[PDB]
Design a binder for this molecule. Structure first.
Ligand code: NFU
Ligand code: NFU
Ligand code: SF4
Ligand code: SF4
Ligand code: SF4
Ligand code: SF4
Ligand code: F3S
Ligand code: F3S
Ligand SMILES: [Mg+2]
Ligand SMILES: [Mg+2]
Lengths: 268, 551, 551, 268
């Protein structure tokens, strides 16, 4: 029984998007790689190195042409003809365009790959862009977050494998099961927001009663995601707002890494 | 003189190129190159100092937490903030739990397949594999039946013809020296490691709000609201849940990881005799336990001439001797300004000229301490603790050595620690001592909350006018980390990170002295230059992180 | 001649008294008494039919789910509702996963300490204990090292002087026949069982909204909103989470529970020859898979004269043959109306008169099937499935018998299943077959959602006038359950529950025939009349639930 | 060292409150009984039966006089002089008053013990009452719910053990960390409530989008508890409203087992 092929290329990645798989429970990373998919290429986990691992990549791109899911994490730097990210002597943008040609499906995992993320913030030293900008006229599935809950990625791949097509996507090509609603339109602190019960300073009376974090700079009103419902790490009750810290808007272009932590969001 | 390149080096964080000249089957000269740059130090510039930690935490997702804590420590240094002791207990539990996950994944998922042949595991007898751990480990998952379940997983992967991640590794290579049984033991421990590191990260998640990339920090302390009686905040039920996961770590660290370190050493004894990176070592003290950013559980310091009697203790993150020594040089890196720069005056102006053997060959800067090349990381922190006569560290190293002695009849002198396997042993000792940090700091937090102290945060006063300089030291899984913040007129005017893999992976410096990676490869035997396993073994012992090294 | 009372019977659900007459050191006569009543049947009267299930679920928290599903099935029968098939898949997954938890906890937490001596386990050799299971089980947690860790936890408990739940058990009692090694094995499995039963309840919780006491049912189907693309509802991520827990159950059930059932049988062979409760057996078919409340995965039926040739199959919850045979009598129970009553015409008027050997002595009514006393539960469901020539049940029973034969040199014939151990074997066979039910129904749900069917609910039409009579059958962990609802002018005018422990624990009926518990005890040898362990062993084999029996 | 003693007495209980312990993770029931407490009396788990288990209770009542936590689940039936719950030939109310004399602390676990619960609903055939009514001179800690999350109980016991006193209690003697807030004042569907985004039938479009269940008869608006935050079974995202059924108000006297499932929170 053959497992569906996946090729994972890292550009300007911090490796947080790969690390998210090590927290997953359904499936666990070991059940992912042994039972669910064949991970044909991944620099972080590959036994093979150098010439031999670039052999595995070439072998897989040919054998599985038209069949593999291409996953990219990290931004793609276009400034100075691609030299801010060089693997085996070539710009990563070239490795990515080559792998994109044979792909059955293409996923941008994380805010860096989805829209440029932190790598493309401020003055954007490397002219970092998101995957859709380097692959115009290809359908990119965007799974943003820094990093996303790994199940936002895994359940997307599972939909492709089980039902033979991608999940339903929004206007930004994000899966609606994970990104269909504002965090603020499904947040358990909304009653505090409605009543004017606000934390003003970490450690204050309102903060210690679990009131709304709007006035500490919560970006939940401007950020699409499932952080308040799916949350993180499958232990229950764990997302940034539950822990006591405002949403930073890491999922959302123009919010995360652009607005200050304590800068107030626009509310619809 | 034959020339090889390894690009990419896999089973590290980020993008590394290694080149070696090989003379007479031995590497005579080496180059380390970080091949990806983001300009994270530029991205954070001109922002409120309070914002830096959320941006510069994204320097790395493998060593998540580390840049976040170092950033708030740097802002707190600039602003003369004393961190509330509960905020120290929480930062310490996160750092120790994260470092547990980090070290376990390094030994198993990143390193083990340099030393372990999975095709040889297929030929093992599970009953004999199980029998040889009798009296060596009290681990409860070393049964013939466990090893058989694991052997059948390997068998089914091979039979599918889809080896994926495991395809075309160094299977059958002549430098692979474990018998089939010890390969199968290692693969079983590889899979068990994944459960242990997941429990470590559940500790991190319950205090950080998630991992990777915690979200509970602030310049001034943490965002966790302590209230034993509060709904939806850090209450006794949440603290009991944290403790339940702390309690699950120790047995795997003590009965599997610590034992596998001695077992790998036992079959690879010449790897205690090569891979020395440096004669100088630096580590920061870590895990402050008072209200004044001091009283560290772990000591740091500076060792020179590979001679522990030179040990100079460092007991403060404000130590001017440490602060004044640190400089970085881009003489052989792709940046414009080449003379050694103190990080508060540091620049990062990209100057890509392509590869030159004698010129610029890396995005990594070359750090020095008073002009010397220095190795950082768990070998460094283990040598400093041994030199400080820390009985806990001596006792833990001696436990690993006792298992080695039982298996081989030989011993390990301190001189043999200056090596590829000594570096691996130092990381294992670090992971073992951190289990007592987690128990100590959890208990300190419960006790302190009981005395009525629920304080977690001091509000920073950031003056709208004036210049303020701050440095944040942290002993990260890979070694001493420092973030250097200059504040001018209430915003970041300069930000420089000097990261542990910057020290270790740094190219030739201003006086052309090779960095630790480059020195460690001199004398590496190569049985087959098309399959340079021996180079990859030495480089993996440093736990390279090139997103850290370059940022 | 000698009269004994066991009050309370522990390691059951609820409040049970057992009295025995002893002659020549053998039980000659017995009485079973339910000592607690709530009047759940009266509490639920005069309500909207839709409300019943949330109220009558609280009949029992050990067999949580069972009364909830039976209640909605009774309202559905009364209103001729065809349940959407996706609602059947979800009800079936909850019932199978709940039943897995229930059976594991019954064998280990409720029953094992009847057979297992914890003082003998302290004397065991962990290596010899491990050696015994070689070639018997492929379980991965049977190492000497696991058994040592377990033996040390018992040693520490006894040494503390605080034995708690283990205090003053039948330690050193003559009827304790396991060697020290097998006692230690059983205690190791006792602790491992608690992890397996937690995974089973995670399946229940993810569909029920919690457990105990699920909250996802409705008269008309379920409250789960199926939408693969919806956030905050039952999407593909939630279904993968459910499947992750389903997949964790099978190994423990097959390699530990199934094997321990045979091991206990091997050391207690005379318990295959005593503890027969009846010659008549009833079970309802279970796990409907169509959109017409039918096509059951598990068959049901009626067996008479302990003779599987008499098997009368039941393949519909609407079978008039099953519906018309059922009556209950309070001739020897603490209610006013003593003649047999069909449940649609039943009453529950308390009439406490205290204990009388010859008169009324229980809050449990005495059910009959066409005037006859019947045993219900896993032995009844096993005998029905064997009589039906269900290959899966024959194969599973033969696997248990093959382990027993491997340990004893002996075999088990169908005649020996009419026994205390045969009853325990039926339960283990049920738990084993339920693991294929979970896989089958999960896959069927995934397949159905794939075809575009997201229907989970049909709104019930409750006429404001008129009389409607309904019955909901369910094969619960302890046997056939039936909820009987009369709707008059839009509200419940009568509600009667006939519960499996009612059939088995019932007192003497209208024609003075003893119930299964009372019959099973006749001929029980008593080594010590002040510690009648032999009586508790037979009674525990029925898995008594007295909140269920009495309600 | 010695473990703190616990004596557990079941009255008119369904055993769901005991069963809650088998779902617990911090601590697990095996760590609870081997490491955190000495469970000196519990009829569901005790090796001893009949005369030997009654010996265990009288030995524990004497040895640990003034030191044990007394836990009661189930309602106590007062009608007809206590005969609706008889253990070892005596009304359970007598067992309870005897045990309560020597108790360091007394906990009513579950809605039945806390206020009579389901057993005292409708015509109340047995004259069932809550534990506070039976023990009018004692401070009873109430941990309601049917059954509550076991950690509501376990973190109460831990507070007594670790800090030598009960946790902070509200006016009904419920721990504030678990019962200090209306479910509706910390419910992640509050934004749907606020926008008038309501499910009106199970399976309808609003229901399949995770909208507010007010109009299916949610009792969140009149029920104190932590169902929306702590939730159940420690897997993440599991409580009745999350899985798509309204809160029934099982925690709250006069709501659960009194109002209809579909009776709206503002109707009496
Ligand atoms: N440990 C570590 Fe990092 Ni990815 C390095 N080098 C940080 O400080
Ligand atoms: N199984 C079971 Fe219950 Ni507590 C019994 N007897 C109910 O149906
Ligand atoms: S999206 Fe965040 S976690 Fe993922 S690579 Fe970018 S910075 Fe790292
Ligand atoms: S502002 Fe943030 S914390 Fe407040 S209700 Fe909105 S998402 Fe929740
Ligand atoms: S509160 Fe609920 S779960 Fe607990 S005894 Fe009462 S009915 Fe059972
Ligand atoms: S679901 Fe219930 S508790 Fe939540 S907002 Fe709606 S009415 Fe309120
Ligand atoms: S910062 Fe990111 S992880 Fe979720 S809570 Fe906000 S979008
Ligand atoms: S019915 Fe009960 S369990 Fe919570 S969600 Fe409502 S109080
Ligand atoms: Mg730098
Ligand atoms: Mg009845």
């Amino acid at each position: 029984p053959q497992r569906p092929p996946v090729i994972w290329i890292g550009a300007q990645e911090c490796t947080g998007c790969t690390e998210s798989l090590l927290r997953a429970t359904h499936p666990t990373v070991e059940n992912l790689v042994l039972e669910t998919i064949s991970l044909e290429y991944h620099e972080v986990l590959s036994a093979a190195f150098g010439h031999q691992v670039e052999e595995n990549k070439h072998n897989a791109l040919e054998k599985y042409k038209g069949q593999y899911v291409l996953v990219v994490d990290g931004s793609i730097p276009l400034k100075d003809n691609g030299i801010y990210c060089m693997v085996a002597g070539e710009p990563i943008v070239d490795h990515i365009r080559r792998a994109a040609e044979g792909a059955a499906a293409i996923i941008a995992i994380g805010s860096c790959a989805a829209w440029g993320g932190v790598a493309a913030a401020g003055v954007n030293p490397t002219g970092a862009v998101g995957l859709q900008e380097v692959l115009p006229g290809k359908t990119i599935i965007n799974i943003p977050g820094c990093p996303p809950n790994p199940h936002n990625f895994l359940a997307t791949v599972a939909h492709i494998i089980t039902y033979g097509k991608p999940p339903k996507l929004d206007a930004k090509n994000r899966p609606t099961f994970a990104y269909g609603r504002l965090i603020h339109e499904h947040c358990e602190r909304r009653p505090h927001f409605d009543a004017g019960r606000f934390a003003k300073e970490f450690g204050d009376e309102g903060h210690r009663e679990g009131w709304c974090l709007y006035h500490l700079g919560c970006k939940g009103p401007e950020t699409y995601g499932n952080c308040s419902t799916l949350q993180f790490c499958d232990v229950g009750g764990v997302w940034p707002v539950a822990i006591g810290h405002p949403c930073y808007g890491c999922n959302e272009e123009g919010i995360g890494f652009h607005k200050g932590i304590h800068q107030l969001a626009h509310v619809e | 003189s034959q020339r090889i390149t390894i690009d990419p080096v896999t089973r590290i964080e980020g993008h590394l190129r290694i080149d070696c000249e090989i003379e007479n089957g031995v590497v005579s000269k080496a180059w380390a190159s970080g091949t990806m740059w983001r300009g994270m130090e530029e991205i954070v510039k001109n922002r409120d100092p309070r914002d830096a930690w959320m941006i510069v935490q994204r320097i790395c997702g493998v060593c998540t937490t580390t840049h976040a804590i170092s950033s708030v420590r740097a802002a707190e240094s600039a602003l003369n903030i004393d961190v509330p002791v509960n905020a120290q207990y929480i930062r310490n539990i996160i750092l120790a739990a994260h470092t547990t996950h980090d070290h376990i994944v390094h030994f198993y998922q990143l390193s083990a397949l340099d030393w372990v042949d999975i095709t040889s595991a297929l030929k093992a007898d599970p009953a004999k594999a199980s029998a040889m751990l009798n009296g060596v480990s009290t681990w409860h998952l070393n049964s013939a039946e466990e090893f058989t379940k694991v052997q059948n997983k390997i068998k089914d992967l091979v039979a599918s013809g889809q080896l994926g991640i495991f395809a075309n590794g160094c299977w059958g290579h002549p430098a692979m020296q474990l018998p089939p049984e010890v390969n199968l033991i290692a693969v079983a421990h590889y899979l068990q490691a994944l459960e242990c590191q997941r429990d470590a990260n559940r500790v991190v998640a319950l205090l950080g709000g998630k991992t990777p990339h915690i979200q509970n920090l602030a310049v001034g302390g943490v965002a966790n609201p302590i209230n034993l009686d509060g709904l939806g905040v850090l209450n006794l039920e949440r603290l009991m849940y944290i403790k339940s996961f702390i309690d699950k770590l120790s047995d795997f660290v003590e009965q599997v990881y610590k034992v596998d370190t001695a077992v790998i050493a036992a079959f690879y004894p010449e790897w205690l005799e090569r891979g020395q990176g440096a004669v100088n070592y630096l580590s920061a003290p870590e895990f402050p336990t008072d209200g004044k950013n001091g009283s560290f559980l772990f000591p740091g310091g500076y060792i020179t001439d590979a001679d522990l009697s030179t040990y100079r203790p460092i007991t403060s993150h404000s130590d001017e001797y440490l602060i004044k020594g640190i400089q970085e040089s881009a003489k052989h890196a792709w940046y414009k300004d080449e003379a050694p720069q103190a990080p508060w005056e540091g620049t990062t102006v990209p100057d890509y000229t392509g590869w030159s053997d004698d010129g610029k060959y890396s995005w990594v800067k070359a750090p020095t301490f008073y002009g010397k090349t220095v190795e950082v990381g768990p070998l460094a922190n283990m040598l400093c603790k041994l030199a400080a006569k820390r009985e806990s560290t001596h006792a833990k190293l001696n436990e690993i050595v006792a298992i080695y002695t039982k298996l081989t009849g030989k011993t390990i002198e301190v001189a043999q620690l200056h090596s590829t396997l000594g570096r691996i042993i130092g990381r294992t000792v670090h992971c073992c001592e951190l289990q007592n940090v987690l128990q100590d700091q959890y208990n300190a937090l419960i006790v302190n909350i009981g005395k009525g102290d629920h304080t977690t945060f001091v509000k920073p006063d950031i003056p709208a006018t004036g210049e303020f300089k701050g440095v944040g030291f942290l002993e990260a899984p890979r070694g001493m980390l420092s973030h250097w913040m200059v504040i001018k007129d209430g915003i970041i005017s300069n930000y420089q990170a000097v990261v542990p893999s910057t020290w270790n992976s740094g190219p030739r410096n201003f006086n052309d002295e090779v960095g630790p990676y480059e020195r460690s490869l001199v004398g590496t035997p190569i049985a087959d230059p098309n399959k340079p396993l021996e180079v990859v073994r030495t480089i993996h012992s440093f736990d390279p992180c090139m997103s850290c090294a370059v940022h």
